[PDB]
Enzyme design. Sequence first.
Site, PDB file in Angstrom:
ATOM      1  N   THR A 255       0.924  -0.967  -0.291  1.00  0.00           N
ATOM      2  CA  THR A 255      -0.071   0.165  -0.236  1.00  0.00           C
ATOM      3  C   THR A 255       1.003   0.668   0.125  1.00  0.00           C
ATOM      4  O   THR A 255       1.876   1.012   0.356  1.00  0.00           O
ATOM      5  CB  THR A 255      -1.604   0.074   1.375  1.00  0.00           C
ATOM      6  OG1 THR A 255      -2.018  -1.077   0.788  1.00  0.00           O
ATOM      7  CG2 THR A 255      -1.448   1.381   1.174  1.00  0.00           C
ATOM      8  N   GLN A 256       0.146   2.318  -1.171  1.00  0.00           N
ATOM      9  CA  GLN A 256       1.167   3.717  -1.053  1.00  0.00           C
ATOM     10  C   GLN A 256       0.168   4.485  -0.666  1.00  0.00           C
ATOM     11  O   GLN A 256      -0.891   4.256  -0.782  1.00  0.00           O
ATOM     12  CB  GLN A 256       1.858   3.252  -2.288  1.00  0.00           C
ATOM     13  CG  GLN A 256       1.693   2.758  -3.213  1.00  0.00           C
ATOM     14  CD  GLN A 256       2.121   2.843  -4.342  1.00  0.00           C
ATOM     15  OE1 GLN A 256       3.093   1.624  -4.716  1.00  0.00           O
ATOM     16  NE2 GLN A 256       3.017   3.897  -5.163  1.00  0.00           N
TER      17      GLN A 256
END
Lengths: 198, 198, 204, 222, 222, 212, 196, 196, 233
Positions: free
Chosen positions: I1-2
């Site tokens: 996740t970013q």
Amino acid sequence: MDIILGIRVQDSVILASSKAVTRGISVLKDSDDKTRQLSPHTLMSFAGEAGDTVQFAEYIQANIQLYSIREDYELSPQAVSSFVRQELAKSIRSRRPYQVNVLIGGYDKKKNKPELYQIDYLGTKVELPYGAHGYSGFYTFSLLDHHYRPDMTTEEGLDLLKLCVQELEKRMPMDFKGVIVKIVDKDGIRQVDDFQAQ
Amino acid sequence: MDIILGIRVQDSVILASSKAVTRGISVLKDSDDKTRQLSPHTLMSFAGEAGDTVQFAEYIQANIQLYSIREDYELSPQAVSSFVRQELAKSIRSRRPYQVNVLIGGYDKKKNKPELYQIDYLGTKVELPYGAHGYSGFYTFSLLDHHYRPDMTTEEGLDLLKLCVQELEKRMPMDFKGVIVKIVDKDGIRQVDDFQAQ
Amino acid sequence: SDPSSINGGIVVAMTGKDCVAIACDLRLGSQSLGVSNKFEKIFHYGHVFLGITGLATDVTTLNEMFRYKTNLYKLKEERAIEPETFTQLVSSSLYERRFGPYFVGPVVAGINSKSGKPFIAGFDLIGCIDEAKDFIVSGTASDQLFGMCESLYEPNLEPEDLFETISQALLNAADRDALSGWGAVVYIIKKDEVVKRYLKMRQD
Amino acid sequence: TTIVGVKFNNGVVIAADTRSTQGPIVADKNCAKLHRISPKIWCAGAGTAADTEAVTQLIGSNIELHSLYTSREPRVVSALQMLKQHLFKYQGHIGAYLIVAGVDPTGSHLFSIHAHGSTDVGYYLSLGSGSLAAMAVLESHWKQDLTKEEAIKLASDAIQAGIWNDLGSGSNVDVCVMEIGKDAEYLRNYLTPNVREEKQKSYKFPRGTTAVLKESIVNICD
Amino acid sequence: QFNPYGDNGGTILGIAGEDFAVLAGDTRNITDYSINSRYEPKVFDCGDNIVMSANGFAADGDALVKRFKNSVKWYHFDHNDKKLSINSAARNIQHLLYGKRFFPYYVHTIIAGLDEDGKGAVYSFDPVGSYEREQCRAGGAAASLIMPFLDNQVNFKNQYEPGTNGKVKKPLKYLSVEEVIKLVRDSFTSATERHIQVGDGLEILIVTKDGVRKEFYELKRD
Amino acid sequence: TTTLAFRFQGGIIVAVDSRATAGNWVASQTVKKVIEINPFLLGTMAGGAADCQFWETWLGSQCRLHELREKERISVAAASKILSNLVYQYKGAGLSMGTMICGYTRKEGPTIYYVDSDGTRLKGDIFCVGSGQTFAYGVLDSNYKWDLSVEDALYLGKRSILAAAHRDAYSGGSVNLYHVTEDGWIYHGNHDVGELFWKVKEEEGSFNNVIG
Amino acid sequence: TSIMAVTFKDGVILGADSRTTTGAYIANRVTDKLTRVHDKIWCCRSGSAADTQAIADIVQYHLELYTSQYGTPSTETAASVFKELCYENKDNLTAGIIVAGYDDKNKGEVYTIPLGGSVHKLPYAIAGSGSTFIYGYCDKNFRENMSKEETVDFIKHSLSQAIKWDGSSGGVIRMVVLTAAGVERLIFYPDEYEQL
Amino acid sequence: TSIMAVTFKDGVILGADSRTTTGAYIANRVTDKLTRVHDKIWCCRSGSAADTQAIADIVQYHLELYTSQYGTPSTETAASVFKELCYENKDNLTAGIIVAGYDDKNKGEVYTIPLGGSVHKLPYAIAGSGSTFIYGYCDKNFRENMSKEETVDFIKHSLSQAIKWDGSSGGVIRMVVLTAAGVERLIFYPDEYEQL
Amino acid sequence: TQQPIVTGTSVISMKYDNGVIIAADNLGSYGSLLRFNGVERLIPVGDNTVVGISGDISDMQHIERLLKDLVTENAYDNPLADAEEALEPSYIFEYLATVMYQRRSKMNPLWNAIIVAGVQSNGDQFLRYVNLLGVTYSSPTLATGFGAHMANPLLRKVVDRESDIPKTTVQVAEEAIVNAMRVLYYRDARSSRNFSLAIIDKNTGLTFKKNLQVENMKWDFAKDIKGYGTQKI
Ligand SMILES: *C(=O)[C@]1([C@@H](O)[C@@H]2C=CCCC2)NC(=O)[C@H](CCO)[C@]1(C)O
Ligand SMILES: *C(=O)[C@]1([C@@H](O)[C@@H]2C=CCCC2)NC(=O)[C@H](CCO)[C@]1(C)O
Ligand SMILES: *C(=O)[C@]1([C@@H](O)[C@@H]2C=CCCC2)NC(=O)[C@H](CCO)[C@]1(C)O
Ligand SMILES: *C(=O)[C@]1([C@@H](O)[C@@H]2C=CCCC2)NC(=O)[C@H](CCO)[C@]1(C)O
């Protein structure tokens, strides 16, 4: 939690454990025996997390029986309790710890003396004349501190427990449906089928 | 929560209410009468938040007694229940609502019929042959749905309740310490001092 | 948590040829626990009918409030209140509690005593009026009701026909809703007479 | 919702779709988003329906009373000032997003008000979830000095962009034209491009299909 | 934070006839209040006379349908081109779904075909693999609007014999493919009227001993 | 959900409702809540439909493998522990299941084991699982006798599910009955609660509070 | 937003972009952020559109009643009324306001009222998200006593840079010239300032 | 932090402030944010001091092994190694790096690697908290093919403005000149650049 | 996740009788800072495909590299690499779609919205979308992000359904798109005036136009607007 009590008298160890098994809103069973015989002269009672409780008990039972066969010998109560403490002390730092508390009552045939061991889920072990887990000690220890004597007979021990159970049945909010009582002495383990009105 | 049960038979309304008062870890009392007579022919049982419970009951009792004196008349059970519903319906939207549930059993001398009203803390009122608050209904309604008959005698009603209480004492996790039972009929309100073994 | 999903219940109103129908289930529960099978959600003031779904205590309170207001209205106006006017009274009464609303879904039905014109209307908890010409739904099975109504409904049905339609809409919507059912009642309304029929349905 | 306002050479026109929703369900397929503040000052509302209606009627009531008190025709800037100060006071809790337009002794006006109380002025405006589809059309076809007919068309096309492309909008197109020297003309359902096709079958039930337990006459007469 | 799931709307419907079965679905694909496509097939022919649709999160639906078709391919490779019976496909799909029990395919899946006796068959699945053979099942957005209808018009629920005092249930005479199609179409035009995610088009796939046929009908585009 | 199973002179009675709900939505009124592990073993399902359906079917596969390996019918104790131990491996992952494993072996006689996703495994005579359990327990507890006749036992179970289907919003649809004998289980029909209710009301006089 | 007020030889000029956004959407591209609170006392608004309008409206009301009783108010007095509102209601307001006025005795004056409600008199002031990008530029190019043409140029170039880097700034550049000569409204379109 | 790299006629110059802060405290006022990863390939560091050092150290290691095998690396190849590290480890790094090198074939080149790990080749680049204040200034004053003196002046003025407005920037201004002539280290003290 | 850092806004497109057109502005935003202006977000693959990318720019550059590799790889031991075995737009898309879904499934997405425009070997137009969730769909018109709300409504007025494609000429289509780009510049706070546009015609091949600009904008009426209600000057 369930009621787990233990008392060490002159020549035996007595374990009393509640019979109820409650799941949510209902009491599913009122004849549950929260105990496992680890060897002819060693008994273990337990209370805690729903599935962990029996899985742990049976796991320990399996290990002791295996040792007995391999060595054609029965480990001393002290040896069995140390093995159990170590198992719990490992578990407490593992991914999913066994949330189980136990009382180990055994009669040491070599020393010819009964022994009672209290061990919580963290691997905290202590040896005592009498002990309990959960809230049980809160209602009963004042009675045991008063009437306990090292030379008590098995019959006196049963009378003292009966008193403890009565106090529990009066002040404790939950209905644990009575207790199953077992004696551990030089001759083995037997169950007092008559405590529903002793 | 506490046990609050009510049944309306042929010529009377019967209320059964648990006697235990538990505070935390201990059962402080096992002879608590969770009821208040609002008028000679109207009885109200209640269960809920620790202090609100009695404060509400006595507040309602004070108001009904005042009305009785002012008018030299006894309000009908229906009138009393509507007054109580309104009080709770106000409370639910106030700063600190009364968290109290009630059963109002009364005998209407004008209609010559018993009446049972169930009202929760939100001011939700309904009239029924039998009712309860909390989890009580979960264990007993199947029995009442089965054995209930509009023409039951007071004695039949007491036997049906006894059955309900037994089911509660078997499947419910908490020890509510039995119940106090009261009958409301054309002659007033009386307590069945013998239900500990009827 | 959601005040509108505690007690359960539904109401539906439909217009027909020179008539209107308003129906409702009779259940009152406390979440999964059924409590009463005789909790009617339809009330009437004169010839104007009002069904209320939602939080039971508010349903009871609102009925008592409108009985109170329509009584004073009759005393001053010296005539019974009409459907259109009552609808306005409902709307303004609900909006008055804009930031502490009654958790209800009201539905008005009736025939104007002077124009003979059939009338139905629905409201959200803060008074927004929905004046449909066909039908109006409310309650925990309102999605199901929308489904039933949108398909089953057709204009100008005669009283006896509208009865069958409104009933089938109610009944089959309630059976797909855990919190609705336990009895049902239908009101067939005409300029002169009003018939009330209790339906037979599953009791689970 | 899709609501728009468009000024033309001698007046202003506002329009709106007719869909009312409760989550993903269409509660009303033909609601009316065009409100009257006074005879010649109309309003298009988006956001919380009970609010746009309530706020429109409240200021409308006070505007009427102000008109009677001053013996003058209501002005759009007055309705605007009363609406914005009311909405500002409620810090956005009254979810009314409006496009207020109208003609008065000083000319024709077009404004927009947001729930928090801020107002805007322009020749073309739109609010609602359909706002972007509508504005795309306005930014593409608007021009200064539109004729009445051109304005109606532009506005009407803007609402359509919303009906077709925005799930929050649908059904019909309502319009209201306010011209400097004439009566305001409200065109309810000026367009109805979404009529339901005939059903495949009739679900009319044979009488007696429904099981009845008890029946009785209801007393209406006192 | 990143959300691995999304909702593309859509509604699908499967009805099992006596010797045929249909699996329908609107062709509208959405994201919030925007239409991604007015025509994006959602029901597929997977070979061996099996039609399937996985509604909900489209990326998941595609992955599943794609994985299943590949399953049919290997079933042939590994079992001497044996035909995959509808019941066997259903069990296979259960394992496909349960394989992701802790990171589910966010879809409601339904397959249609004929069982080994030539009878019409429909199976509906849980996002996690729970399944049941059923008469008819609506899936997706408007599922709650359609099921009640079907209970009434397909299983004749709450309908009794006129005159029997609701003592005699209306007989369960079974429908033809033409009568079923009518119900399907009315189910969707109705759903299209009340649900903002249903519309644009309706594509039905009919399965008989002769294979898979397709029909298409327009739905309102608002 | 309301599922029950009880031991008696004639073996075991297993009764379940058939309703499936997601919130207030009635997803189905015709769901199977009993898994036919094999001709001699029955499993009930409460909680997660997928979890129960999946692992109880898998259980059957394990039972079958046992019988091929040991050329002897698996014991209820052993079949139940297979499921129990499997479920325990997943403890904490989120499985959701309340189950009853039922069988009648020569070696054990009528046997019922309650097994849940918490890892609990309990042998008993009477068990009810589901949002309607308390309702079924009331009926069951007051009419149960070890010496009930197969005919009367079947009715008790059917009646108990009926009590629950009536009061529990999450229970209803129909009742599915089973009788378990040492020679296997015998299915005893699907009973629509709609019809079953009125019938029982008239013939029994119960549900006096409901207008019929 | 990008707004600024600059004092020069003959008085003072106010400038601003014309963009109001609600997220990435430009709700209004021809917004007028230059508001009159008196004949020769105007303000530049940034922050909440609703808040700054309500503030401005009240200031105008106050200065009108002030005028009726004590005659024309000083720019300082106007900035004080603004301040009172912004400081006393700091918890519920998001308003960055530049006050600019032309007095005959005092000529042009500029007061900037930032978020907390403090007041700062300066030769010139910049504010709004877009201002962050032109601090260096403005500090290097501002000179006191510039001519009307120079000042219009300084503002035009400054704001075009602000609009260039700030997505929250855009549209046209509006200016209001305040001198003894009166009040002048200037506007510059994209095609002109973008290629500066 | 305020850092920039500017290409000009004879090559490229890197510049930076010398302040590292931990909150309001200046942990180091003579920091060297200009790091060598090869003879004529340097970088400007902003963001995490720990992260940028570890990155630079690894890049240097890579370019040394590159040189041993394939000879001198292109500035583009150096920027690519930086990128690989910054992009592939974006979740655990906070590094804004400007890569600048002098090639004989390519002369001066500038690549800016912002937070996400993307690469951007430009005539010049600015970064660091302080850069926000000089976007306008730099965009108005940068010209291609400037002389060494002009470029040093552009950088000196730009950074002095950055240091002026940014509390996170300060100390001395360091520069590194990269041309065919070699490598030159320049430093400018407060007393000089503050009064520009 | 970013979380996306440097981003590209809308990518709009539509298909006409002989091909497809696709466009995207040249901006690389950094939050509200319009940081980079020479960013090309239209990626040509071979001469029958153009991939338009929006979202995270570092990921876009990564997809660029992936695309160059596909070309190199497809050429390996392929004597028909520039003929029957050259990359089809549908191959390029299925590839990316595959990657996008695998990456979301590992909870580490390529934070982009992609549209693949091109012409198949048999002349068929190809236009499909895929985003960071692995979601995909086709339509006569396709736009990402902001353009989905403002460009689609306009482009759909030209091609509302399939039967409208054969009736649309490159001139009409290019006109619609260019107008949409102007509208996006009017209301999208993250847009640029400069943009690139590409056409893939089954006859004229691939035409790639760089450095276009929004022209013919209407701003004059702004002068007539003063105040926000009652102000007159
Ligand atoms: C449009 O704003 C809106 C409409 O339902 C109301 C209806 C009547 C007058 C005010 C506008 N409001 C909403 O909240 C809906 C969208 C929610 O996302 C809808 C349909 O756009
Ligand atoms: C009962 O336990 C349950 C049923 O839906 C499933 C369905 C099939 C087999 C297992 C039982 N489970 C639930 O989660 C439902 C209630 C959710 O609030 C329901 C109906 O009780
Ligand atoms: C500028 O500060 C601001 C403007 O929209 C308003 C508009 C009118 C007068 C006050 C300034 N304020 C905001 O909040 C906008 C950005 C929202 O993301 C903008 C453009 O910066
Ligand atoms: C500049 O980016 C920064 C510097 O302290 C470091 C120091 C050495 C090389 C990388 C840049 N980074 C920070 O985090 C500082 C501010 C902390 O509040 C500062 C000065 O901005």
